[PDB]
Amino acid sequence: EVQLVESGGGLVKPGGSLRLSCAASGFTFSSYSMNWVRQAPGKGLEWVSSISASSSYSDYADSAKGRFTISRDNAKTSLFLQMNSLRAEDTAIYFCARARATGYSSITPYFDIWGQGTLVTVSS
Amino acid sequence: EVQLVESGGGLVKPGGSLRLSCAASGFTFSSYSMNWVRQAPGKGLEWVSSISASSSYSDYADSAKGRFTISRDNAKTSLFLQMNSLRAEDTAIYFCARARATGYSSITPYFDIWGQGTLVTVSS
Amino acid sequence: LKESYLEESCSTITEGYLSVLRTGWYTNVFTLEVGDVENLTCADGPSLIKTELDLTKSALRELRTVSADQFVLGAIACGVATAAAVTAGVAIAKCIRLESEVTAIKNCLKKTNECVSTLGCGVRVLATAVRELKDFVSKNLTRAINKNKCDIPDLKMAVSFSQFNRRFLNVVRQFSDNAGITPAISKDLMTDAELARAISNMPTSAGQIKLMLENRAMVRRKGFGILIGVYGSSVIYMVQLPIFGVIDTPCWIVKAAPSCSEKKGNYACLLREDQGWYCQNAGSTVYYPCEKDCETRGDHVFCDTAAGINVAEQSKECNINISTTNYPCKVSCGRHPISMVALSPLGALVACYKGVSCSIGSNRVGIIKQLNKGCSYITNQDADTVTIDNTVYQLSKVEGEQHVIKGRPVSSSFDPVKFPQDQFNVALDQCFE
Amino acid sequence: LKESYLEESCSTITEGYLSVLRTGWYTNVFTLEVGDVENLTCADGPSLIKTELDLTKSALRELRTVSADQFVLGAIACGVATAAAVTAGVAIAKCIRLESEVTAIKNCLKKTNECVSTLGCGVRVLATAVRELKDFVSKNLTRAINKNKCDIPDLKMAVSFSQFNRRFLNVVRQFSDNAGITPAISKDLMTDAELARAISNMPTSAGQIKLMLENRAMVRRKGFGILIGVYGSSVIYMVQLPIFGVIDTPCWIVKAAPSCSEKKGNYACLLREDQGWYCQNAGSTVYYPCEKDCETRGDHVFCDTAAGINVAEQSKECNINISTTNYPCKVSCGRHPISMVALSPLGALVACYKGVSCSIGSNRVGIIKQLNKGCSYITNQDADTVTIDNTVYQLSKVEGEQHVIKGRPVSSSFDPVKFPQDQFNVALDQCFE
Amino acid sequence: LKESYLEESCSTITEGYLSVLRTGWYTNVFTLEVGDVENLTCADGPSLIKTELDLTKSALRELRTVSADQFVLGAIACGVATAAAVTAGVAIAKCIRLESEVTAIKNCLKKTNECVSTLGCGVRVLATAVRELKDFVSKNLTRAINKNKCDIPDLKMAVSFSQFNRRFLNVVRQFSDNAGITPAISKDLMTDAELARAISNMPTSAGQIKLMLENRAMVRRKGFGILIGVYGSSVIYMVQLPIFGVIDTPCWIVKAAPSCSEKKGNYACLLREDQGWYCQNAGSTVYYPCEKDCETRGDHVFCDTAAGINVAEQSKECNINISTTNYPCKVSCGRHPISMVALSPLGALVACYKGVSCSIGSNRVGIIKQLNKGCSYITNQDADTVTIDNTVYQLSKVEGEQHVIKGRPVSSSFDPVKFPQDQFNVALDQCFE
Amino acid sequence: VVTQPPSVSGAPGQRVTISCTGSSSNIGAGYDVHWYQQLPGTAPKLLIYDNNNRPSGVPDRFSASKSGTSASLAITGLQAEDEADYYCQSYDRSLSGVFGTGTKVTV
Amino acid sequence: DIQMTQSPSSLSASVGDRVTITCQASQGINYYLNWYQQKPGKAPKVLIYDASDLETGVPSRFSGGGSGTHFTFTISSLQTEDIGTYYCQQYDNLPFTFGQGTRLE
Amino acid sequence: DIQMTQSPSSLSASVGDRVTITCQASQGINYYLNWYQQKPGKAPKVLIYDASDLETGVPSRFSGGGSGTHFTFTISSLQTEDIGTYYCQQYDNLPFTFGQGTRLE
Ligand SMILES: *[C@@H]1O[C@H](CO)[C@@H](O[C@@H]2O[C@H](CO)[C@@H](O)[C@H](O)[C@H]2NC(C)=O)[C@H](O)[C@H]1NC(C)=O
Ligand SMILES: *[C@@H]1O[C@H](CO)[C@@H](O[C@@H]2O[C@H](CO)[C@@H](O)[C@H](O)[C@H]2NC(C)=O)[C@H](O)[C@H]1NC(C)=O
Ligand SMILES: *[C@@H]1O[C@H](CO)[C@@H](O[C@@H]2O[C@H](CO)[C@@H](O)[C@H](O)[C@H]2NC(C)=O)[C@H](O)[C@H]1NC(C)=O
Ligand SMILES: *[C@@H]1O[C@H](CO)[C@@H](O)[C@H](O)[C@H]1NC(C)=O
Ligand SMILES: *[C@@H]1O[C@H](CO)[C@@H](O)[C@H](O)[C@H]1NC(C)=O
Ligand SMILES: *[C@@H]1O[C@H](CO)[C@@H](O)[C@H](O)[C@H]1NC(C)=O
Ligand SMILES: *[C@@H]1O[C@H](CO)[C@@H](O)[C@H](O)[C@H]1NC(C)=O
Ligand SMILES: *[C@@H]1O[C@H](CO)[C@@H](O)[C@H](O)[C@H]1NC(C)=O
Ligand SMILES: *[C@@H]1O[C@H](CO)[C@@H](O)[C@H](O)[C@H]1NC(C)=O
């Protein structure tokens, strides 16, 4: 099955660091852009960051700029998010999503496959 | 074997005429420029004349201009040099040479196959 | 870049190209305001202004008549690619041609030289006004041409006019020569200022914007223009710029030369026919069989997805033990051993068989090596040149990691089928055993 | 237009096109009078006039050096069409190049700008004089260049001169860059007024005249020009305009895409190879395999009869009986299923096999349907777009009538031949049973 | 010229063409001095000079962004030919781009407009300066644009400027449109004074010099240009002219048309696939399979050795008794009797089978003959035209000696193989017996 | 004229270098240089073509170069078989084919 | 006069932010646009000239582009000293109008 | 003035020799170059005009070519009457400078 599996989410003290990992399986992972999306508990989804299919481009939300660093290993078929200076407001479920676009009208990507997400808690 | 064989060399009184002949064998004679070169006994090589692969172009050294006339019969695979007004200074071994060039940098021909040459003596 | 010499099939695969693939079109509708010209007449005699004016008015009157009308995979793909492009553009022009759309486009360009507009058919075209000639004709030439008698002593007027109309006349020339659909976007259809502005307006990710602004020569080359028509004294035309909705995916190019071998002195050859560009698109391997399709800048290959043929994900097994893959790898095979050099990006394949004398040499050293007969792979580091008899090929002095994937060639290891021995573009197991 | 989907071979035939087939050439011989220019020299210094004069005199001196040199059916046909055109044009220029005929042409153009002349080789050429430059050089410029001074303050004449000679200089570039035979008739070889005259002078029926006067961009496209040389200070050249001696006969175009079936889980495919334009000419079916030559405007398809291969009148049986006919209908067949869209005029054939996901949709609704695997025919009324995985093809929104000619596809109903299974461009019964 | 009709295979061989074959490249490096332009600014208002100046400076600033990147035999050969050419040229440009080499080149052109230079990589490029614009900008325009005012009353300045920059703007157009590598040497890259001067400097035999000076349109047509870059305010580019290191060797062209016979009413057709140009090079037969490769001027055929494929010297046995040589003469065979005219240089092959009515006629006499069924050879002396149904082909009126090499056609003397009967591009003994 | 030293000599195993000093009409005009060996009583044998390319069947110890208006042949590993005349050759823009004055090697 | 509209009138950003500023002429000014930074209490300082070219010693994080009528300026990763007011300035014709000045804080 | 450098200052050649003379302007003079022969003690005689065109009286062994700045004149087979002095002469602009004159012996 086409599956994404996040891991590495846990409890972190504010100012701590964490590294989320999203193993990808069942698809030609090197073909697809990959994304991290998060959801503060009971809040809406927030996009966090994206990486191009060969890592040549990386994008971050204003909350993520400088604090996070997305990376991918196309040989390990694994997607990573380093996180630093975690604020209490960064407490959320983080999903990785496969991202896909049709260029016909515009390039807006959409998130066809999602992982079940890893809970990150940032608290004392 | 690829061989050139000169013939017709002999003794001529000054002001006489001679016709050197170089039979070519073992190669596609109509593909190659052909040359005559000579060597006064114990002196260096002197280029004498040249003819293009189907006789459209003929070249002569300043000593040979007007006095000699190169020609070829591509059906007889034979190269000829008519000679007239032979001076004592024309006493030499005459070699015919197959001439070849690579056009990559410049067109300077070189003489890959030589005949064993025929001794022309111009004296009383 | 990487280049694996696949020994067993005398073919390289060159890898680590990144991809840019056109997946849609972005429309800019230009309104070139030709001006008030057909209210001006020169009636005194021959004059400079009259000649430029007559050309301008004659060109406009000409342009009103011009209108648009509205397996060997290579010939297929480049058939579909052109047909798809024109049909996609025509389908948009057929919206813009509606007078209810032209008048909306024109109205939003009343106050500004650039407008974003949504057509009633939903396409969110950009619209642009080109207006320099109208401003000249209205402010200068109408005042100078006076009561006719335009043979005024002011020659700055006449020379000025021959500058402003020059763009307009070039647009007429290009649409008229091409019968309303140009093959490429000239500087006269869209100047560099307008192309950069149009790119910066596209609804696309910033990576594409930066990439397109760097490679704007490619954007100009992939796009094309369609004449909408002449409305009042504005010519209206549209330029379809590409949208590169797939970028940064892997691509590779496969090159091959005849892998011949001699059995009892009879040659048996095969040639890989699956040559050309491949890319991964959105988790599908896509093959671009026609040589017009794809063009390289650096690592980026700019293909068009309308030209791509999807090929099974197993088809990469033709690059690793084609001798035993079950996929029908397409080869030609036959008797006649062509001797040739195939120039790869990081080196050359040199097919060299009985007959021609093949050698490799350096400008500093001359002949380095006489090549063995049989297919050889010459990295661009081994030599500067390869020769095939008197012919010399200069090699590409480009850095990258060459590799050899070793194996006994297929034609050296399977017996050819006795009949037909010569077969064109067939699955490999029809040639051998 | 009418379009039948031929279900049993995954090929459309589109009908109701009307032929317009070139069958001869009409010659217009132009005497472009460059004038007295070789008697004018500017010798005072750099000047505007001197620069335009030197360009004119140099271009004229350059032009004097210029003169002309004198089954896979597509490669055959387009070669013959090219060779026949040039040979037909050159055979007339070899008449006109006789001084005995230039002097006649020039003399009949003494007091008229247009003359009808019969060459000694019997061809009734039209002849035309262009004089605008000679008139300027004789009445204006010769009068101003006093005593080789021409740094003269009358800047009108420098600017004016650069207008008059522009046609001449453009003609010189077009002939010199093509070594005496242009591929098409530029506005500089023959202006719109001269083409309209030339068409109106052709010995042809008024139906052709009206049709040619409307489609004059096509007449300009099918014709070509030959340089006859420079005689005194006139350049003489000729334009071979087409004569469309066949019009209004039926034409049709066949499109096909791979018809595949998974007999025993492995595929077998065929592709029709007899694709492209057909017309009835004079009671013979003529096939035009060149993609270069045949070209539609509306219902009229313009083709060159020199590019046509006659095919037996029974060959239309491939559009009814292909399974059962005894005519050798050409196909390719083999294992590998290409999935692709072939855009017909009134719709799309959509080959969609194991692998890609094909869907059709409208801008108004999105996905209308997921297509069944196998060849499908999508009228431009069923959907606005077809997709093949991520690739989207816009369909031609063209009104017409679409038909389905039903039948179980050949590749589903006949068993493949076991060896060779892959065969290129073969009569159908060599692929099946 | 000589032409043998080979009755045995319905193919002509035309002989007595002489040869010219490109074997290397000569580099001319042009320093076009754009001059001080980026220190001049019009700032008063709209003006003639400002418009030309802005175009010049805008074009220059654009050009700084332009850069280059620093078996069916025909597709193979023309693939290699272009790849070899660009790689040979790029390898030299990549030496000249080094600042040590540009500054040497520029320095030797300080007090001479022509210099011979040896690059550090050993190539002895010629170097040329173009200064006409620099001289104008420095001496005239810099003095005219006082204090950024430039709407001066001197219109001779503004019209003069639009002449001098014309070359520069054309060079920019050509390199930018072609992304730094032009396909041919325009008059703007290399004027005809510079081409003759460059040819006269080539390190070549006087025979080639005279031949090149006569055929300089071909020298221009075979060469190509590469943009080195903009350095200071000089654009530097280079032009690779051909070196014709093989001349005067024999060449011949083989033409063929379908040979068929109605065995029990079934047409066992055969067609030779080895058509096109052959030459002897340095004692090797070389075949030039791609139609772009070779072009005639009288007896001289101008081919490119990088396009040639070596063929065994035995291959001329296919022109003597193809029936019975053991060399694998490439043919196609099959059921369908295409009827067609193949125009040879000295006549026409006329394949005329069941169906079409073929006739030959002269303008003096009309129909001379109705041709028999089967392939016929019509010398250009027998008739002026051939017709196939309503289609008429004009024959090439050219003096030469035609011959017939008699023999019963292969199609009529060997039996076709029962299966596969249709085979493409196979050795003859796979079609017959 | 293309000039060479009248003779050179060395012990076996020495390197000896034969110069071929041409002029701006030949070697300096871009024409390449060729070298021929002539053993006594034989026709010349091509040693080198196009400055430095070596025919099949010429020992790898013969090596050559061209630079400026000059060329040289380095006979590395000088040997008894090298007791021969060596002629350079080029082409002259005025004289066409020009052989040098020819250098005898002496072992 | 060329009017030099310049937007947005103010910005705020983090260190590391790829802030961008736009200037838009009332006519074509070719590429004759300069960008200046004025630090508070300082005379302005030129950063870019000719629409695109870094003045000598300007940190390579600064950049700009555009031509004709629309121009842009970007600080590819803001730094704490880049706080200040940025002005465009055309020189296509006299008088050399400066833009409105956009304060970045 | 256009300076008309001309080389070599003195040929010598045999009958039958394809002698060639070069003239080289200091500027572009289009094709406006004439070549004259002067025999010793005679008024000069025009041989070529417009760089390339034979005057009607002169033997067809004479020839010339070139444009712009380098021009060449050749006697395709020297004859004993051809011994004399040859001069080029531009007419591109006033004054009409003759070349240095090259004797031919
Ligand atoms: C075209 O007309 C405009 C408008 O009259 C001219 O612009 C004026 O030019 C003069 C002289 O340069 C100035 O004094 C005025 O200030 C300009 N503006 C106006 C509103 O008058 C322009 O010069 C004319 N010519 C061209 C080529 O544009
Ligand atoms: C070229 O010369 C003709 C006459 O040779 C000029 O035509 C005359 O122009 C003046 C002024 O416009 C009129 O008064 C005359 O009536 C015109 N005709 C004649 C016969 O003199 C013409 O203007 C000149 N220039 C051009 C560009 O044609
Ligand atoms: C460009 O400048 C040169 C040098 O000033 C001009 O050459 C002068 O032209 C006038 C023409 O009346 C002559 O009187 C002078 O003798 C020339 N030489 C000098 C040194 O002044 C030239 O005319 C100017 N214009 C152009 C188009 O070149
Ligand atoms: C311009 O032309 C149109 C059509 O001839 C006319 O209606 C309009 O009034 C004209 N305007 C002027 C200012 O001449
Ligand atoms: C080789 O071909 C076999 C076919 O069975 C396939 O399984 C394999 O993946 C291919 N590649 C390699 C490296 O074995
Ligand atoms: C024009 O040139 C020709 C050719 O030299 C000459 O015969 C004729 O007399 C000249 N006419 C004038 C008016 O100069
Ligand atoms: C189809 O075949 C039948 C006989 O098999 C024939 O009579 C008929 O004419 C064929 N179809 C057409 C359109 O002719
Ligand atoms: C021309 O511009 C360059 C650009 O740096 C400058 O160095 C030079 O001094 C300028 N020269 C003049 C005369 O303006
Ligand atoms: C003709 O056929 C014979 C017999 O097969 C063959 O040996 C010979 O090579 C052929 N000769 C030529 C000239 O093709």
CSV table of C-alpha atoms in Angstrom, one decimal, chain E residues 16-238:
chain,number,residue,atom,x,y,z
E,16,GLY,CA,31.1,11.8,-62.2
E,17,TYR,CA,30.2,14.0,-59.3
E,18,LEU,CA,33.4,15.4,-57.7
E,19,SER,CA,33.6,15.8,-54.0
E,20,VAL,CA,34.1,18.4,-51.4
E,21,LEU,CA,34.0,17.1,-47.8
E,22,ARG,CA,34.3,19.1,-44.6
E,23,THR,CA,37.0,17.6,-42.4
E,24,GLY,CA,37.8,20.4,-39.9
E,25,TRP,CA,36.9,23.9,-38.7
E,26,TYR,CA,38.7,27.2,-38.9
E,27,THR,CA,37.9,29.7,-36.1
E,28,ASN,CA,37.5,33.4,-36.7
E,29,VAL,CA,37.0,35.3,-33.5
E,30,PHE,CA,35.2,38.6,-33.9
E,31,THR,CA,35.5,41.4,-31.4
E,32,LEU,CA,32.6,43.7,-32.2
E,33,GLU,CA,33.4,46.9,-30.3
E,34,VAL,CA,30.1,48.3,-29.1
E,35,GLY,CA,32.0,51.2,-27.7
E,36,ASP,CA,31.4,53.7,-24.9
E,37,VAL,CA,27.6,53.4,-25.1
E,38,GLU,CA,27.0,52.7,-21.4
E,39,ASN,CA,28.5,56.2,-20.6
E,40,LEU,CA,25.9,58.1,-22.8
E,41,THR,CA,22.5,58.8,-21.5
E,42,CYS,CA,19.8,60.9,-23.1
E,43,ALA,CA,17.8,62.5,-20.3
E,44,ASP,CA,16.0,65.5,-21.7
E,45,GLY,CA,13.0,63.8,-23.2
E,46,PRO,CA,11.8,61.7,-26.1
E,47,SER,CA,14.2,62.0,-29.0
E,48,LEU,CA,15.5,60.2,-32.0
E,49,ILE,CA,19.0,59.6,-30.5
E,50,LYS,CA,17.5,58.5,-27.2
E,51,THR,CA,15.5,55.9,-28.9
E,52,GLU,CA,18.4,54.4,-30.9
E,53,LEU,CA,20.7,54.8,-27.8
E,54,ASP,CA,18.2,53.0,-25.5
E,55,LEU,CA,17.8,50.2,-28.1
E,56,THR,CA,21.6,49.9,-28.3
E,57,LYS,CA,22.2,49.9,-24.6
E,58,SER,CA,19.1,47.7,-24.0
E,59,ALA,CA,20.3,45.2,-26.6
E,60,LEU,CA,23.8,45.2,-25.0
E,61,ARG,CA,22.4,44.7,-21.5
E,62,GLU,CA,20.2,41.9,-22.9
E,63,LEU,CA,23.1,40.2,-24.6
E,64,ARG,CA,25.1,39.9,-21.4
E,65,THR,CA,22.4,37.5,-20.2
E,66,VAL,CA,22.5,35.4,-23.4
E,67,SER,CA,24.8,32.4,-23.4
E,68,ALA,CA,25.3,29.1,-25.0
E,69,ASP,CA,25.9,26.1,-22.8
E,70,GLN,CA,29.4,27.6,-22.3
E,71,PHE,CA,19.3,0.0,-38.9
E,72,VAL,CA,17.8,3.2,-40.3
E,73,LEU,CA,21.0,5.1,-41.0
E,74,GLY,CA,19.7,8.6,-41.7
E,75,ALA,CA,18.6,9.5,-38.2
E,76,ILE,CA,21.9,8.2,-36.8
E,77,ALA,CA,24.1,10.1,-39.1
E,78,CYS,CA,22.4,13.5,-38.8
E,79,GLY,CA,22.3,13.0,-35.1
E,80,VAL,CA,26.1,12.6,-34.9
E,81,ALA,CA,26.8,15.4,-37.4
E,82,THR,CA,25.2,18.2,-35.4
E,83,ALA,CA,26.5,16.9,-32.1
E,84,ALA,CA,30.1,16.8,-33.5
E,85,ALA,CA,29.9,20.3,-34.9
E,86,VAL,CA,28.7,22.0,-31.7
E,87,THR,CA,31.1,20.0,-29.5
E,88,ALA,CA,34.0,21.0,-31.8
E,89,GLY,CA,33.0,24.6,-31.7
E,90,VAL,CA,32.2,24.8,-28.0
E,91,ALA,CA,35.6,23.2,-27.1
E,92,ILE,CA,37.3,26.2,-28.7
E,93,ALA,CA,35.0,28.8,-27.3
E,94,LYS,CA,35.7,27.3,-23.9
E,95,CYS,CA,39.4,28.2,-24.4
E,96,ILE,CA,38.7,31.7,-25.6
E,97,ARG,CA,36.4,32.5,-22.7
E,98,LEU,CA,39.4,32.5,-20.3
E,99,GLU,CA,40.2,36.0,-19.4
E,100,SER,CA,43.9,35.5,-20.3
E,101,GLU,CA,42.9,34.6,-23.8
E,102,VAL,CA,40.3,37.3,-24.4
E,103,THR,CA,42.8,40.0,-23.2
E,104,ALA,CA,45.5,38.6,-25.5
E,105,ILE,CA,43.0,38.6,-28.4
E,106,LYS,CA,41.9,42.1,-27.6
E,107,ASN,CA,45.5,43.3,-27.2
E,108,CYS,CA,46.8,42.1,-30.5
E,109,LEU,CA,43.8,43.8,-32.1
E,110,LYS,CA,44.9,47.1,-30.5
E,111,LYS,CA,46.5,48.7,-33.6
E,112,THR,CA,45.4,46.2,-36.3
E,113,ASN,CA,41.9,45.2,-37.3
E,114,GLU,CA,43.1,41.7,-38.0
E,115,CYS,CA,45.3,39.5,-35.9
E,116,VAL,CA,46.4,35.8,-35.9
E,117,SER,CA,46.4,34.4,-32.4
E,118,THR,CA,47.4,31.1,-30.9
E,119,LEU,CA,45.2,30.1,-27.9
E,120,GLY,CA,46.7,28.5,-24.8
E,121,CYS,CA,45.0,25.4,-26.0
E,122,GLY,CA,47.0,25.6,-29.2
E,123,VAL,CA,44.3,26.4,-31.7
E,124,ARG,CA,45.5,29.2,-34.1
E,125,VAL,CA,42.4,31.3,-34.3
E,126,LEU,CA,42.2,34.3,-36.5
E,127,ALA,CA,40.9,37.4,-34.8
E,128,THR,CA,39.1,40.4,-36.2
E,129,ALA,CA,38.0,43.7,-34.8
E,130,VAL,CA,34.8,45.5,-35.9
E,131,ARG,CA,34.9,49.1,-34.8
E,132,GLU,CA,32.5,51.1,-37.0
E,133,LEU,CA,30.1,51.6,-34.1
E,134,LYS,CA,32.8,52.4,-31.5
E,135,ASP,CA,34.4,55.0,-33.8
E,136,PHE,CA,31.0,56.6,-34.2
E,137,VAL,CA,30.1,56.5,-30.5
E,138,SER,CA,33.5,57.9,-29.5
E,139,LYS,CA,34.1,60.6,-32.1
E,140,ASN,CA,30.5,61.7,-33.0
E,141,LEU,CA,27.9,60.7,-30.5
E,142,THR,CA,29.9,61.3,-27.3
E,143,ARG,CA,30.5,64.8,-28.6
E,144,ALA,CA,26.8,65.4,-29.5
E,145,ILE,CA,25.2,64.2,-26.2
E,146,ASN,CA,26.1,67.3,-24.2
E,147,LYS,CA,25.3,67.0,-20.5
E,148,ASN,CA,22.6,64.4,-21.2
E,149,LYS,CA,20.7,66.8,-23.5
E,150,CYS,CA,20.4,65.0,-26.8
E,151,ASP,CA,17.3,66.3,-28.6
E,152,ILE,CA,19.8,68.2,-30.7
E,153,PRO,CA,18.6,69.8,-34.0
E,154,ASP,CA,21.1,67.6,-36.0
E,155,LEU,CA,18.9,64.8,-37.4
E,156,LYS,CA,21.9,63.6,-39.4
E,157,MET,CA,23.3,62.4,-36.1
E,158,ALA,CA,20.2,60.3,-35.3
E,159,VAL,CA,19.8,58.8,-38.7
E,160,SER,CA,23.5,58.0,-38.9
E,161,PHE,CA,23.3,56.3,-35.5
E,162,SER,CA,20.5,54.0,-36.7
E,163,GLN,CA,22.7,52.9,-39.5
E,164,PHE,CA,25.9,52.1,-37.5
E,165,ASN,CA,24.1,50.2,-34.7
E,166,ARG,CA,22.1,48.1,-37.3
E,167,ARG,CA,24.8,45.4,-37.5
E,168,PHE,CA,25.1,45.2,-33.7
E,169,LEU,CA,21.4,45.0,-33.1
E,170,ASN,CA,21.2,42.2,-35.8
E,171,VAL,CA,24.0,40.2,-34.1
E,172,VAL,CA,22.1,40.5,-30.8
E,173,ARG,CA,18.8,39.3,-32.4
E,174,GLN,CA,20.5,36.3,-33.9
E,175,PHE,CA,22.4,35.1,-30.8
E,176,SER,CA,19.6,35.8,-28.4
E,177,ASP,CA,17.0,34.1,-30.6
E,178,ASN,CA,19.3,31.1,-31.1
E,179,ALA,CA,20.5,31.0,-27.5
E,180,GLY,CA,24.1,31.7,-28.4
E,181,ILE,CA,24.7,29.3,-31.3
E,182,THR,CA,23.4,30.4,-34.7
E,183,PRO,CA,22.7,27.7,-37.3
E,184,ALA,CA,24.4,29.7,-40.1
E,185,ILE,CA,26.6,32.7,-40.7
E,186,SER,CA,24.4,35.6,-41.4
E,187,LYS,CA,25.8,38.7,-43.2
E,188,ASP,CA,25.6,40.4,-39.8
E,189,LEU,CA,27.9,37.9,-38.0
E,190,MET,CA,30.4,37.9,-40.9
E,191,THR,CA,30.1,40.4,-43.8
E,192,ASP,CA,31.3,39.2,-47.2
E,193,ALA,CA,34.4,41.3,-46.9
E,194,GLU,CA,35.4,39.4,-43.8
E,195,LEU,CA,34.5,36.0,-45.2
E,196,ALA,CA,36.7,36.5,-48.2
E,197,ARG,CA,39.5,37.8,-45.9
E,198,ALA,CA,39.0,34.9,-43.5
E,199,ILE,CA,39.0,32.3,-46.4
E,200,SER,CA,42.2,33.9,-47.8
E,201,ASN,CA,43.8,33.4,-44.4
E,202,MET,CA,42.9,29.7,-44.0
E,203,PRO,CA,45.9,27.3,-43.8
E,204,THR,CA,44.9,25.5,-46.9
E,205,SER,CA,45.9,24.7,-50.4
E,206,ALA,CA,45.3,27.3,-53.1
E,207,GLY,CA,43.0,24.9,-54.9
E,208,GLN,CA,40.7,25.0,-51.9
E,209,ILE,CA,41.1,28.8,-51.6
E,210,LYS,CA,40.0,29.3,-55.2
E,211,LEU,CA,37.2,26.8,-54.8
E,212,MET,CA,36.0,28.4,-51.5
E,213,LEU,CA,36.2,31.9,-52.9
E,214,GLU,CA,33.9,30.9,-55.8
E,215,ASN,CA,31.5,28.9,-53.6
E,216,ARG,CA,31.6,31.3,-50.6
E,217,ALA,CA,27.8,31.0,-50.3
E,218,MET,CA,28.4,27.3,-49.4
E,219,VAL,CA,31.2,28.2,-47.0
E,220,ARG,CA,28.8,30.6,-45.3
E,221,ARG,CA,26.1,28.0,-45.3
E,222,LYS,CA,28.2,25.2,-43.7
E,223,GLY,CA,29.7,27.3,-41.0
E,224,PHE,CA,28.1,28.4,-37.8
E,225,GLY,CA,28.6,31.0,-35.0
E,226,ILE,CA,29.0,30.8,-31.2
E,227,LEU,CA,28.7,33.7,-28.8
E,228,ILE,CA,31.7,33.9,-26.5
E,229,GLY,CA,30.2,36.7,-24.5
E,230,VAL,CA,30.3,40.5,-23.8
E,231,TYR,CA,33.6,41.6,-22.4
E,232,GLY,CA,33.8,45.2,-21.4
E,233,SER,CA,31.7,46.8,-24.2
E,234,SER,CA,32.9,44.4,-26.9
E,235,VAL,CA,30.8,41.5,-27.8
E,236,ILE,CA,33.1,38.6,-28.6
E,237,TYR,CA,31.8,35.8,-30.8
E,238,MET,CA,33.4,33.3,-33.1
